[PDB]
Subunit: 412 residues, 4 copies
């Protein structure tokens, strides 16, 4: 049974990434699929190139914000279904940022900014393309165009963290020549992570795929490939409302609490997680996304000891709880949900009674257990023969609520 | 059954207010009850007065934000349990903003800012006080101190929208001399709404509004049959705390906020959305995000949010939908809709979506969504008072959480 | 809270009773409220007296079935809303069993059968009456009629376990003259338990609570008489037999309900509706057989076990009952244990915790098979954690009970 | 594709009775007791000596099936314990001919089914704990399994079907299904072959595949150019299939009724299981369930057998569904309450609009099957919406799943 290749091991250590949707669609703020979904006249929609100034895009600020949220990589949409490229395609197309008023290779600014902050730059590429008539009219030539667009990314920006391929609504059954495309990527970017949102066709879609995406609600530890074959990692994605590109009248935002639980859940099932934000037309992080990033950032700073290196382990929680354990080489960590805030005396807020939370699968004697957020030592008992650990999971100090609270176990 | 007195009818038309928690506790950003709950030394806590600059308090910005969110009044904490007064108590106490570096009557700034935006200013007053030893040592004198503190508010700021009394953790047995306190308010501010946290029987005839739990399932209680009608109000804060709490990450979804606002109207209550200011008096960025989202919803819902009332029209089994009545229209408030894709791209909302209601007996001419004016198809059975509409899903790129259809009668 | 009077104390030890609905309505088999709810013609409906033979009523079989199910008392409907009396009213009314072909005092047969099986006989009396015009047309005279009907029951059958009064709720404003009614009962039946479906009258011993009440019930104000509590469950949606009511509860929910009643400090009545002629229906027999297996296993705790301030861990429905010698863990949501490849759900260690046990424990064992459980305690925080093993293949008790033996 | 005629007939059966009875029945601690309780094999097998079948009456079994509205019966002819309830004619000594009963139970069973116009089906466990061949010589085990089926195919005349349980034990091994099934086709061309482990069928000869009871959506009928395969779900009354005396964890009759309706909604048959006592009697508990289910299936007879799923969905937040026959549609309506009167409110008295999408034809009349009450309704033919006022139950009744028949113009 295979173990991850070094570059995949590294990918798993990244833990959290920021996904950034930004394209011509951003100017209309009605979702990234607007051209197809709203049946827009193609010519009129493509005129959006003329007002693509990128006047507020600051890759340095974006990389800084990603670092502060505790992300270790960023996936930027280099070309979405609309087919507009955020980089210099060096003559491949006129529908690129060099032909917009911006006149800046935004991908170059992005990679430079990522490097300064020690973040891996990843490139999102949509394979279903609405711009080029090649897609319907001459699919083999389309493949060449797709491949060349990828090749430019592989050869003009230095080492790349990875590629994130999106083939939602792909041509069913057509030959995508993945071995040629992935093969080319390996030749120029041997170390790049290849991610696919259609990497599972029963069975990976190509040997060169490193990561497959999964739905955020996946209950159990994800699939890592057949037992004698290359280990493939997993990734889940969450966007803040219902849309990936900015959508001004989409008010259906998830709670910050659910965001935190999703990040925790991803780690529990052995996947990375991407948190998505949609930039404004001119390239700014919207205020709403800033709020979510600030809250997530406080959680990830507290969870830093386990968020990156923590792995799933055969330790289960007791009946009726959502609690789980993550393992690093030096420690185990209890991730504890559904805690309440502690009041005092007459003021009952919910958390003040003893709160025994049990786990099954810990066989080693424990010296100390403490909450990461405030270093409070927890009392506990063990039955080593049955591998039971029971901790008194105290509630939050008044004035705080971490949503997912983490206790570090220090072994005897 | 009595109907609301005019001032209470005006209150119910306010619909939505903003609650603002700001005090010395704000500087520690660990919740408004920190002094008691964290067992602080009183002297050390009360030193916070020395750094209360209010350097970033701008009542105009706050009034403007309230206007933009669609709120029609603001409840500001004038004195919380900590017992510090945000206004000039004119010698009643040294623990007031006049004795802080800010040196500004913040209530005066607040009332002026409310008037310029046509918002009603409401004053929150805690009756359980941790600062004055009168509270435990000389309760009759405490009553006089409480009453005098309210008297200052009734006499120094012009007409006031209302008072919001918080009796949480009070002495429930004691005689609070409510007739004298409320009576005094009636004398100076005949038109003020009196709201009570702990208003069986109402706690005093002069109470106009009583508070209710956020999740109360059914239309609220308005008082006994021959008695004065009392209105209701629910409150929601964005995380678990009312004052700012920097490490409280447990924020509710904006969607739940919108559903709570709609729910309050559905059960015949006003709703307060609470924000906790920073130590220096700024609206925190997180609160701004929620206000921006809520403001888009309330602008869309303006035709019904204020004048709409509960009416004996129920929704079909398995839905959370409900109806609000104004004098000219009924409005269907429809939940659990999905976004519409196109053809092969299925987002959830594209099939016909029959939503039914029971209790509409009049022939309908037209029904349309407030957000985009799309006309809905519908059928009626007038004898059984059934209405069924095809509630189309959201246009791609939008999601209103609670979608509202206006009914136009023949 | 005062200490319960001895009769009340005895009542709480009864634990489980059988409720029996049987009247003229039983012949129709469309529910006990049929006369009112189906708007029947009163004269035509009352003709059912002419075919009330009680040909299959055997009070001995009923008492035996109650004994076998582990019930300690039986509440029999002596007169329901329909207003027909199952006993000899000695001239009070012609609408009684002595004027039916049965021509037997069924209450007499019932009390004798209860006594021989050592069960307390309780009499159910409906106070909302559809038969006598007095009810609407002359309420004060109705009160006298009601009172006399109870007086017959208090004077003609020897000592009675109790009275179960249903239906003052019909007229919540009216003066029901409870002191005279209850006082009369106290005079002739000082030890009888008075159950009523601030408390309405000082003589009331027991108050009914809904089946779903979450918390330990109310026992009256401090310095006042302690009053007990009782909950009721029927097997489908109706109390009298209802042939086309297919909406029966699971036997599992029945067992959980009985367990729940004890947890909140109440007795529980399980209701059965007899057939027209007075037989226990086959469906009710099935439920009684299943309940009887559970109550036989739970006998150590079912009668004497009382609620105690010991709570269960987050996310479990488990609870604790206290007797003078032992505590008992009542554990829900267990699965059956498979073996090796065959995973049925119960085979991993299953830590279930409780908070409020401060004393060192010597042993814990399941009542059903005597298996000893492993456990750990933290005496300072009063935490007990047991490994609640799953059921042996081939069994499933729904509510499993572990007995704690203290050092 | 169109179902083969034998498969179409199977689908019309709707409901069957599953009967578990073997040596394990004597223990009353579940049918898997020998393995799960780690019993000594020799000691367990001695149970053959007290297998009298003294209370087995195949006519009572057939009668109970008839009364519940079942159209076939699946009897366990050999379970994992490996004991055969029929004469294996020299294949094995571990059969009913070597027990005190001395009668071929299968023969009695087939005769009793034929007299009630029920199809007899034979359940056969392919995972066998008795014969050492199973672990020690799998190819020879296959021959033994096949011969045991051959006896069933050749000694009883035409049979309704075979119900194979347990190739899931060795998921990798070659079970030689073409030879086993081919043999069955040769002697019993019209028999339904059901498989417990059947997006690819395990053999072309399989007619029916089993599915989980809780499957949400209409079942899979096979790839678009290939043989149509039917589906079946199973429910037992408690947690065990064989009798289990101290298993008190019985499902509600209401859940049983909902499961039967659910099977039909998803286009499957349903088997309701009963475990006989040691000596072969139907336990009283099973009789109670049968009687309750029988009242429902008698009321649902117009649609239970011929009703099929159809692209008509119910409104948001209801569990209602529609079944189609050639002459009618039927609304199956859940979560109704009983109707009180005036001040006595039982829950069902207000107008109760229940909607469906996908009916495009004008309707003349709609009425409840249980009492013939006519329902009021409105239609929007352009959007294919039907809304009915689903009145609650008459006091004294509660059908759990209520059925309204639609009569078209």
């Amino acid at each position: 049974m295979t173990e991850p290749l070094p570059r995949i091991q590294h990918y798993e250590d990244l833990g959290l990434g920021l996904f950034i949707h930004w394209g011509l669609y951003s100017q209309m703020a009605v979702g990234e699929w607007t051209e197809l979904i709203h049946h827009r006249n193609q010519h009129d929609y493509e005129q959006l190139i003329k007002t693509f100034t990128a006047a507020q895009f600051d890759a340095k600020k974006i990389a800084h914000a990603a670092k502060a949220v505790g992300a270790k990589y960023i996936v930027l949409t280099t070309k979405h279904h609309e087919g507009f490229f955020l980089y210099d395609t060096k003559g491949l197309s006129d529908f690129d940022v060099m032909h917009a008023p911006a006149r800046r290779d935004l991908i170059a600014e992005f990679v430079a900014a990522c490097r300064e902050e020690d973040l891996l730059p990843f490139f999102y590429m949509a394979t279903y393309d609405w711009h080029t008539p090649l897609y319907d009219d001459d699919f083999p030539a389309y493949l060449t165009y797709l491949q060349k667009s990828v090749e430019v990314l592989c050869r003009n920006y230095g080492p790349v963290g990875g590629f994130w391929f999106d083939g939602n609504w792909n041509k069913k059954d057509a030959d995508w020549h993945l071995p040629e495309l992935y093969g080319m990527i390996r030749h120029y970017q041997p170390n790049a992570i290849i991610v696919s949102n259609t990497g599972l066709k029963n069975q990976v879609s190509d040997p060169e795929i490193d990561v497959v995406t999964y739905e955020r609600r996946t209950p159990d530890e994800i699939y890592h490939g057949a037992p004698n074959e290359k280990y493939v990692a997993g990734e889940i994605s969450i966007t803040l409302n219902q849309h990936w590109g900015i959508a001004a009248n989409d008010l259906n935002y998830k709670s910050p609490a659910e965001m935190i639980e999703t990040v925790a859940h991803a780690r529990h099932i052995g996947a990375n997680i991407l948190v998505n934000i949609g930039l404004t037309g001119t390239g700014a992080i919207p205020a709403a996304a800033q709020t979510y990033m600030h809250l997530l950032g406080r959680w990830t700073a507290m969870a830093a000891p386990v968020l990156y290196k923590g792995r799933p382990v055969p330790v289960t929680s007791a009946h009726g709880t959502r609690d789980f354990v993550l393992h690093t080489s030096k420690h185990d960590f209890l991730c504890i949900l559904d805690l309440q805030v502690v009041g005092k005396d007459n003021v009952v807020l919910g958390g003040e009674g003893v709160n025994p939370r049990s786990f099954v699968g810990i066989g080693q004697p424990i010296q100390r257990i403490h909450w990461l957020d405030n270093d409070e030592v927890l009392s506990f008992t063990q039955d080593l023969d049955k591998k039971v650990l029971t901790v008194d999971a105290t509630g939050y100090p008044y004035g705080s609520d971490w949503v997912v609270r983490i206790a570090q176990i220090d072994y005897e």
